[PDB]
Ligand binder design. Structure first.
Ligand code: KGM
Ligand code: KGM
Lengths: 158, 158
């Protein structure tokens, strides 16, 4: 089991970490949704599909920088929404094909009234999502740490 | 500086802890706000206003039980909104009168789509707000710990 990103890098069998730079809407008002869709940027595949099945959860999702202080929100995972930053590990998604399937994660962030100005700075870490992978075959328990960075400035018009 | 509640328990000079039971809207839809307004339930006053002016912030806000798991939200403090659970201490509100003035705190909670049924249980701890009071006179820095419980069940229609 391993994952890669859209045009970026990969994290191999065993787990590890990778950076993900995401394009964010450059202007968002108070009460509107910032949507960070990672199902268009993170993809994994099962490496022994005929004998092993891989179970994949979002173990922990964390907010940083401007997203931590100026936003409140949720994370949608395989069609279900949970509070973001996360307070518990999500239910598992099954990966059983050598073809790359998306990691079904999306953050839904809305700015707070006290936000004003550069709510998120470009190039800055905005979230870190952790993909935990297990299986039906052995003791293996692996974390793929995704560090999410902003490609652009986000502004909240005051 | 001291505080009381509406049918009132009190936290005396020096700080301490108290319980607050709050009436909640029994039904809240996804996309709607559950509003917990403590400005109608928590009141404070200055004990030597002719010489001392007291500074009061919301130091920390923590979410519990069903609020922790099925809601995302913000906390409003003196006309500005911040993420709830909190990530930082708020700006200070000034107390300079022996008259009881409300603590200007309100929670604004919205249920997550994966929620359904009794999202908050009656009698359960749903938040803990910490009032920090200081002043311009001496070293005093006192904490008033507010434990917020639901008076009734809150249901999210699935
Ligand atoms: C049947 C012989 C072993 C065959 C799978 C070898 C590779 O194991 C890696 O790939 C596996 C299959 O995707 C994962 O389930 C496992 O946790 C790890 O990521
Ligand atoms: C003629 C000067 C009288 C001075 C009385 C000071 C009394 O201190 C109490 O009341 C002060 C004013 O509310 C508080 O700042 C302090 O923390 C404590 O609650």
């Amino acid at each position: 089991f391993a994952c890669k990103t859209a045009n970026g890098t990969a994290i191999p069998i065993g787990g590890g970490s990778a950076n993900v730079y995401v394009n964010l809407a450059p202007v968002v008002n108070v009460g509107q949704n910032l949507v960070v869709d990672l199902s268009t940027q993170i993809f994994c595949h099962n490496d022994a599909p005929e004998t092993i099945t891989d179970y994949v959860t979002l173990q922990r999702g964390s907010a940083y920088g401007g997203v931590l202080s100026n936003f409140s929100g949720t994370v949608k995972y395989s069609g279900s929404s949970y509070p973001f930053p996360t307070t518990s590990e999500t239910p598992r998604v099954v990966y059983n094909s050598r073809t790359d399937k998306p990691w079904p994660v999306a953050l839904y962030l809305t700015p707070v009234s006290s936000a004003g100005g550069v709510a998120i700075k470009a190039g800055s870490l905005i979230a870190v999502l952790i993909l935990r992978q297990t299986n039906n075959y052995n003791s293996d328990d692996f974390q793929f740490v995704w560090n999410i960075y902003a490609n652009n400035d986000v502004v909240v018009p005051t």
